[PDB]
């Protein structure tokens, strides 16, 4: 079960990628939007999931914000578990 929660890692990487793709898709078309290219969108996602939120990038559209919210929870839940498991096996 310990490394079975390590499956959250699987989920997270998927949400991060989908998030990045979806983020760009939602943001382009929004005048001034900066989250409009995949690479950095991918960086934005980690920045967001880890909840570090630097401010160098963020969504300005409604769906962009929705994708963001999903990524945030994914991150929080995911890291929650990996921490709880590392706490168990030690």
């Amino acid at each position: 079960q310990w490394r079975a929660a390590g499956a959250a890692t699987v989920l997270l990487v998927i949400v991060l990628l989908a998030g990045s793709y979806l983020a760009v898709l939602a943001e382009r078309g929004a005048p001034g939007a900066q989250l409009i290219t995949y690479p950095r969108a991918l960086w934005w996602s980690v920045e967001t999931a880890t909840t570090v939120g630097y401010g160098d990038l963020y969504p300005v559209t409604l769906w962009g914000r929705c994708v963001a919210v999903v990524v945030m929870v994914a991150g929080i839940t995911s890291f929650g578990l990996v921490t709880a498991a590392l706490a168990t096996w030690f």
Partner: antibody
Amino acid sequence: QVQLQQPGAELVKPGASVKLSCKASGYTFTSDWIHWVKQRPGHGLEWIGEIIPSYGRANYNEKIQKKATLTADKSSSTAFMQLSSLTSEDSAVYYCARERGDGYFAVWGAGTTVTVSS
Amino acid sequence: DILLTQSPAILSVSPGERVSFSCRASQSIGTDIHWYQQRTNGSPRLLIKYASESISGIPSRFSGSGSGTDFTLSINSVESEDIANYYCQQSNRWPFTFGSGTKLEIKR
């Protein structure tokens, strides 16, 4: 091999519409965007709009009157730009270009010269 | 939307001389600037990406520099084949925009 193939020219009578095509080859990714750029003789490059074939969504330059409607056929790897109700102001070379979702136009088509005349 | 100013519109240089094209953005765009070359009756061709990254196939003669609002495209030792119009383009914010272009003229 030529990554983007566009027809050489299109003659359109004032008020009529025309559908330009852009046939793409080479590597294709879900992150590719196909852009269209307009260039009048002796003038610069003007961005018209973009479309993401993998999803089908299109965005347009808000600063100019909307003359185009973009679509894409995944099976034939072809992108289309429908220009409607044209006037001589619409006469120009229309390029299609491919962007790998990373901000720059890696490659351009040869361009289609559109002439609006009777 | 981001305005890209390319001035002067025409640049005259002597053969083998180094030349520099200017591109100024209305606001800071990091290094999200790309340069294209367009010869008479030809289609645009990517020369430099992200302000200073080389593109395979382009002569070493071409280089770029700058970040923020001011960018430069340089050609070391210009030659006839470099005669063309040069455009900058930004991808920092939507929508992507193009500069108005600078023509390279050689005084032989």
